[PDB]
Amino acid sequence: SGFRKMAFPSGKVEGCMVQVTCGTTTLNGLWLDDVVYCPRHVICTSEDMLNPNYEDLLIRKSNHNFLVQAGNVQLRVIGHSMQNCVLKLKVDTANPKTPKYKFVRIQPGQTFSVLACYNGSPSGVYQCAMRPNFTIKGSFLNGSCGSVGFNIDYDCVSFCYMHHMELPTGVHAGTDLEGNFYGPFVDRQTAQAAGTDTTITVNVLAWLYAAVINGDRWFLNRFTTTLNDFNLVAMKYNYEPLTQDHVDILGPLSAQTGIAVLDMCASLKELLQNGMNGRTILGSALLEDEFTPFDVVRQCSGVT
Amino acid sequence: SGFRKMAFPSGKVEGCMVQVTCGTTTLNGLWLDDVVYCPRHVICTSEDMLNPNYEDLLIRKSNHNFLVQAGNVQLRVIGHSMQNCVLKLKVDTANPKTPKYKFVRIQPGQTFSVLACYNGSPSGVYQCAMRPNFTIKGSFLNGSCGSVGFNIDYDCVSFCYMHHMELPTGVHAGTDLEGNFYGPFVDRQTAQAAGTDTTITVNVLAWLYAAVINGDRWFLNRFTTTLNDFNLVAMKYNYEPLTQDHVDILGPLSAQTGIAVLDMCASLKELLQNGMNGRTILGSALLEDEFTPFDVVRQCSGVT
Lengths: 304, 304
Ligand SMILES: *[C@@]1(O)C(=O)Nc2ccc(S(N)(=O)=O)cc21
Ligand SMILES: *[C@@]1(O)C(=O)Nc2ccc(S(N)(=O)=O)cc21
Prior knowledge:
The first copy, chain A, is built from 8 helices and 13 strands. Chain A is α+β, with helices and mostly antiparallel strands.
């Protein structure tokens, strides 16, 4: 009973967090095996950030200029290299707390947990979605760069995000663990446009299935629709178009509840066209889109 | 930038989770030093739960009947005892991952993180508030009993909650770590009334301060009010009455934003009397009450 915006247990990621200092700049790093990963803008002063030439700035740096501290012990840097927007600092000791892990590039609409860190120390954990426009609506202050996003499958941590930027619009931008930004963002303190964001339709429907499973049924109606009819309403309300792939992923939830995916689409169409009328669904007064169909099944079945 | 319902990093608590089996019943336990804490209803069959005589049921049990497994290793039980609604199973080995800890009984309106577990394994972490009526609106399935709520102050974990019950209304009930239930609940599968719940006024105001800090200012008005006038509106909308103690706790937030607490009360009064008019505050379409004044300061300053 109950449905919550749940993050993964963060323990395996906490044991990987280190502090990285270069000159006067400090941010977070991720220590896996004998490599520490961090945003390359650790080599910049706030002055350099307006238009940085990263290749030129890194050339002024040597292994001894990167101070890596794990808790209270110092790591010895024996190599440094830039890969896209991350620096990989080779250390002489493998992290004894390195969990089984993968680096993955998530798709927009997919979710992950963020372990917000400051000075190498974890402050908190929350669940995010990578927006269709490749931004994240996180909680990041100065010094949070290097904090990572991840998913956990039994004992394997798939790292998917590293925080780099707080855009002037208040949204957050970052890279995968190979240093490639999600979206058109660059690691430069300049005005950068995030595209028009849309609501993740498959996640809203998955969340409506979670509401039915937990008792919130008031929104269910006597109507059905077609993918084409629904997509006309989706277009009007800036929802991602629903595809047969999305319908297929909702299969298990449709099977467990006995509610056809297109009947749930008609309930969503009525909610979009008429609002909530002052009511709530799972304690929320808007349509939640940060739970994937996989999150709902996992939470509703109790997968550990 | 950004404000999220953030949970504490759960690592220190993950290292304390064990599985406890007694007969055919399995739930979670908390291993701290050489003691494993779990709900006493682990000794019941679902049949016993309708009207259990715990003293009589425990007498049929011996140390060898309690199977405690931490990950994959077995703990040797050398003592058992019931304290209120918890069982304390003395084990022969102190948990090497026991963090610095305290047992605390939280007040209603205060918040904490829950590490939802099944069969001794962590599945997720989320932030809760202890409702004014002493229930929690969590996410708990069968097998989640023994999962704990906690707060962390630097390196000290203060355990405040242990999950015991899923009430027929879909809300959750549990105890502190001494086994005393929060509220009038008993560990019996019977119809139990949760009192009338109220909204935690001081937390809503603290959340309104968090919205001002992050840019959401539309709700601010040209009005002020008095504690007596505000409490008349609070009464009408089932909000907890605001006291000078609550105003005092909002002091630091009032100082950082330059918005007098009673001016923020008048904005809240207007939101209560007029609704949101289809707008949002911090991505929410209702008034959030699960952030204390301490949570807001901690998140907005980046305390680790
Ligand atoms: C990031 O939060 C950090 O730790 N340091 C830093 C410096 C500059 C930016 S910004 N203004 O977004 O370019 C972000 C971070
Ligand atoms: C609790 O979730 C658990 O793990 N086992 C158990 C048994 C009975 C209840 S109930 N129906 O709430 O009394 C809760 C739990």
